[PDB]
Amino acid sequence: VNSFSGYLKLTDNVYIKNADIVEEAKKVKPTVVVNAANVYLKHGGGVAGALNKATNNAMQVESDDYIATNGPLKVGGSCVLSGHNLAKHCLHVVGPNVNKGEDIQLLKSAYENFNQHEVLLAPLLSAGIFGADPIHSLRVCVDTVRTNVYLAVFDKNLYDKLVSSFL
Ligand SMILES: O=C(O)C[C@@H]1CN(c2ncnc3[nH]c4cc(F)ccc4c23)CCO1
């Protein structure tokens, strides 16, 4: 039994809700919140800019030190950093950004990072400003993630389309 509330159940292990991931994170304090990161951990907009703003820029400060030590992530890769005031940990996952021409097949590799964590609060990878089709992202998520994932979808309209079209 966990503390996530109001989710619709899509499969054995995937759940979905219309929620602001920042507000869901601050209420739930999940063990892991997933950030829709880029390889430079530059949290300027989208989910990343919102999560970072909610940490009063502490996420960005920590991220800049991570990059200075380790260099950029790979597209499809991830790193575990602090969750600050939002979660115990933040799993920064780099989905492909279609608006940069990155290979959408890397989306499956990106979701594989979720399998290293028993339970996660997450956005749909490569959706929003990363330019991929969110319906496709949900399909890859369901077909790749085996651990328990609670998906937050900010936009009520897209949420309804994702549910109504789910196979
Ligand atoms: O980057 C991707 O792969 C897909 C993303 C997913 N995004 C979100 N998902 C869930 N909760 C979210 N709260 C937000 C608050 C904001 F100010 C901006 C974006 C979000 C947001 C929307 C942008 O696209």
Curated annotation (Swiss-Prot):
- Identify the residues that the record assigns to the Macro domain, covering every copy: 1-167
What is the protein name given in its UniProt record? Papain-like protease nsp3
UniProt subcellular location: Host endoplasmic reticulum membrane
Catalyzes what? Thiol-dependent hydrolysis of ester, thioester, amide, peptide and isopeptide bonds formed by the C-terminal Gly of ubiquitin (a 76-residue protein attached to proteins as an intracellular targeting signal)
What fragment of the whole protein does this chain represent? 1025 to 1191 of 7096
Q: What does this protein do?
A: Responsible for the cleavages located at the N-terminus of the replicase polyprotein. Participates together with nsp4 in the assembly of virally-induced cytoplasmic double-membrane vesicles necessary for viral replication. Antagonizes innate immune induction of type I interferon by blocking the phosphorylation, dimerization and subsequent nuclear translocation of host IRF3. Also prevents host NF-kappa-B signaling. In addition, PL-PRO possesses a deubiquitinating/deISGylating activity and processes both 'Lys-48'- and 'Lys-63'-linked polyubiquitin chains from cellular substrates.
**What subunit structure does UniProt give?**
May form homohexamers. Interacts with N protein.
Ways its activity is controlled: Inhibited in vitro by GRL-0617.
